[PDB]
Design a protein around this ligand. Structure first.
Ligand SMILES: Cn1cc(-c2ccc(Nc3ccc(C#N)c(NC4CCCCC4)n3)cc2OCC#N)cn1
Length: 258
């Protein structure tokens, strides 16, 4: 019931998450202030597995200054046996908040979208394509969405192919536009309450449906024609035809108060 990171002492309240290797806690320091500590167990991981967490920490360090839509890493400790990461605790992950809500406020959704774009745009500017974008990768802090990780690490639950882009599937026999596809489905989930291919349970049929142009994604008419425009442009199978994040940011949907 106690963790020491770079001198400071933190007391474990509860546990938020657990990977095979790692664990996430809600903690309090000496001043009763709330934080989140990612503890990773390095006993024992391959030379390759080690570098993944090293890379994730390095990039999470280098990017603190460039955006506040990246989660805040206050301090960290790393030995040969463990890693501890003192981060923002926030309120709740986007994945869980989506389930515990039935209908989503349009004004909230637009501000959440604008936040994700900013965050993903940032990592792109430093040559980082998140290879596995999902709601669970975003943290709500004061109603502000923040990116938690960069997909370089090994992912964590409190395993879906819904957010997977066609080019990744066609690759079996990286582009920044992949994150644009995954973000599309997250906003699609915020717009129509489900992901574009959620209901197809057969996995060899779902993946075939994603890549297949003959399969057509249904877009019901919403009172926000722009939101519609975004949804269609993001869900284009051809990454050259697909909209870019700098384009997405000049889009009326995010720029026009209506
Ligand atoms: C159903 N539920 C999930 C949460 C929750 C979830 C996450 C966080 N905060 C953080 C803060 C940092 C990380 C990291 N790294 C992280 N990761 C979780 C781990 C499990 C998978 C989802 C992301 N979560 C705070 C959360 O709220 C507790 C607080 N404060 C609350 N209810």
């Amino acid at each position: 019931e106690c963790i020491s990171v770079k001198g400071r002492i933190y007391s474990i309240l509860k546990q938020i998450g657990s990977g095979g290797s790692s664990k996430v806690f809600q903690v309090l320091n000496e001043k009763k202030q709330i934080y989140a500590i990612k503890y990773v167990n390095l006993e024992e991981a391959d030379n390759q597995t080690l570098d993944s967490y090293r890379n994730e920490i390095a990039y999470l360090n280098k990017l603190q200054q460039h955006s506040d839509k990246i989660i805040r890493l206050y301090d960290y400790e790393i030995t040969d046996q463990y890693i501890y990461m003192v981060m923002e605790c926030g309120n709740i992950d986007l994945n869980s908040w989506l389930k515990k809500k039935k209908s989503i406020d349009p004004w909230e959704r637009k501000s959440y979208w604008k936040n994700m774009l900013e965050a993903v745009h940032t990592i792109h500017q430093h040559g980082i394509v998140h290879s596995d974008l999902k709601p669970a990768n975003f943290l709500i802090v004061d109603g502000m969405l923040k990116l938690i990780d960069f997909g370089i690490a090994n992912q964590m639950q409190p395993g879906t192919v819904n957010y997977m882009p066609p080019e990744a599937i066609k690759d079996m026999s990286i582009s920044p536009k992949s994150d644009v596809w995954s973000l599309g489905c997250i906003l699609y989930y915020m717009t129509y309450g489900k992901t574009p291919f959620q209901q197809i349970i057969n996995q060899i049929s779902k993946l075939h449906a994603i890549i297949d142009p003959n399969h057509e994604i249904e877009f019901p008419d919403i009172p926000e024609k722009d939101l519609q425009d975004v949804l269609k442009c993001c869900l284009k199978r051809d990454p050259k035809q697909r909209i870019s994040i700098p384009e997405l940011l000049a889009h009326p949907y995010v720029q026009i108060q209506t």
